[PDB]
Amino acid sequence: KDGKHYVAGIGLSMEDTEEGKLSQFLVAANRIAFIDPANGNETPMFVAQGNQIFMNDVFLKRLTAPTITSGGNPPAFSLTPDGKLTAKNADISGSVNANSGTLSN
Amino acid sequence: FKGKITESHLGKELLEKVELTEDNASRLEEFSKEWKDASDKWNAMWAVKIEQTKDGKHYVAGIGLSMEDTEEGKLSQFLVAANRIAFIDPANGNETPMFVAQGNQIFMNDVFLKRLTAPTITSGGNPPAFSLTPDGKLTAKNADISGSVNANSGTLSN
Amino acid sequence: APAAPSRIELTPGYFQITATPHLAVYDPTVQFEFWFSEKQIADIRQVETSTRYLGTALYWIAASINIKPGHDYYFYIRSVNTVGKSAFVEAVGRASDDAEGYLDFFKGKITESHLGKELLEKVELTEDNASRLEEFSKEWKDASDKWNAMWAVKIEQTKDGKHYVAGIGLSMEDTEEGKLSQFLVAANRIAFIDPANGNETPMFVAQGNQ
């Protein structure tokens, strides 16, 4: 288009390195979407586009994220790489072991 | 994204098509077509759409990669319409999947991230050990903080 | 008249809920009628009309794709005998949440499938330094007069007497409810890249269960 190129494609390959044969599945596309058509469903449940991934409810074993946000401007809760935890309320059924505290009441 | 996929070429190609109508009729299909649209520009798509009919109802599954022409430029789209998308690492003959997507749910093993934006986070369980809700609530069993706790109010037993 | 059960235990499981009752007074001559529901009904007299009839036994297990993890489902349990039915009692149950357990269940389900034994568990090629690509799309009828379809590209190689296999497959097979689709990718590195503006940095890399 107007002198600029656009290339997309999928590919499964098995190549060789000093260790042995390594397999690799690759998808180069601007938007990768997964859709479950059960009972005629059309809402995607995994859409990756522009270095961003949008997913529905997800089940996990271990997460390693240095930044976690609740969304919104003035987010509701947030954890940041400096160890900061920002929240609006907190119930703790046991003990709060802090090195310092500043409370109004 | 559902709307954008519906307003695409594969949305009415891999889906919205009702080929075959009688019971026990199954078609295996795979095409590779590039053609010029009404906008005098080329759109291309390669797809494997396999469909079956049972009790008068249609089950269609498919893989499809296309690139079409938007107003600003060419957009490429890879789509997988299936009831269960699974990724498996076969190293040393492993069969346990590491990414299973089914029914608007994604199950994964440990994952590394740069930034997460989730309103609800749960530890899993009847009474979750820890939880974070969109109303700003942090529920936990113990809280060890190496610095300062700056709060408007506090209610401690001891 | 038989009394309502004192307690109901519900063992969770991967896409499944167990249900066994227990009475304060033991009586082996009574059975239990079990009904399942997804949404709570305020009225109790129309549970028999608005809930699925799970069955009648001393205990039951409801295992289906419809039951999802992280969701609360309702069970209506009653005690019946030669005298008559008893009062209906509510119970709340959820499936398991362990992603490791669900991935083990999914490994079992994939192994108990046609692509599981197609892209894996095949020992084609035996000599060293031998490789083959094989792309096939076949539809065939099973012994149960149902049709199963599949399309798979499989790469296999041999080195120093060991087999390295990778594959990409899309299939729809027959299960006890009808037909179910599946898309399997077996490879040592699964990468998603956005090539806009000459970008090569992947935005999703799956490898080594990470």
Residue numbers in the entry:
A (entry chain J): 871 to 975
B (entry chain Z): 818 to 975
C (entry chain F): 713 to 922
Per the authors:
Bacteriophage lambda’s tip protein, gpJ, plays a crucial role when attaching to the cell surface. The gpJ protein, comprised of 1132 residues, is located at the bottom end of the lambda phage tail, serving as a key component of the lambda baseplate. The gpJ trimer not only seals the tail tip into a closed cone but also extends a central tail fiber, providing the means through which lambda phage directly interacts with its host. Genetic evidence has identified the E. coli receptor LamB (ecLamB) as the direct target interacting with gpJ during the phage’s attachment process.
Therefore, a high-resolution structure of the complex formed between the C-terminal truncation of gpJ, starting from residue 713 (referred to as gpJ713), and ssLamB in a detergent environment was determined. The structure elucidated the interaction between LamB and the lambda tail in further detail. RBD inserts four loops (L1-L4) into the extracellular lumen of LamB. The interaction surface is significant, with an area of 6195 Å2 buried, a PISA calculated energy of –4.9 kcal/mol, and further stabilized by 45 hydrogen bond interactions. Upon binding with LamB, the distance between the three protomers of RBDs on the bottom side increases from 1.8 nm to 3 nm. Correspondingly, the top of RBD narrows, with the top loops moving closer to the central axis. Nine new hydrogen bonds form between the second and third layers from the bottom of the β-sheet, reducing the interlayer distance and the distance to the RBD.
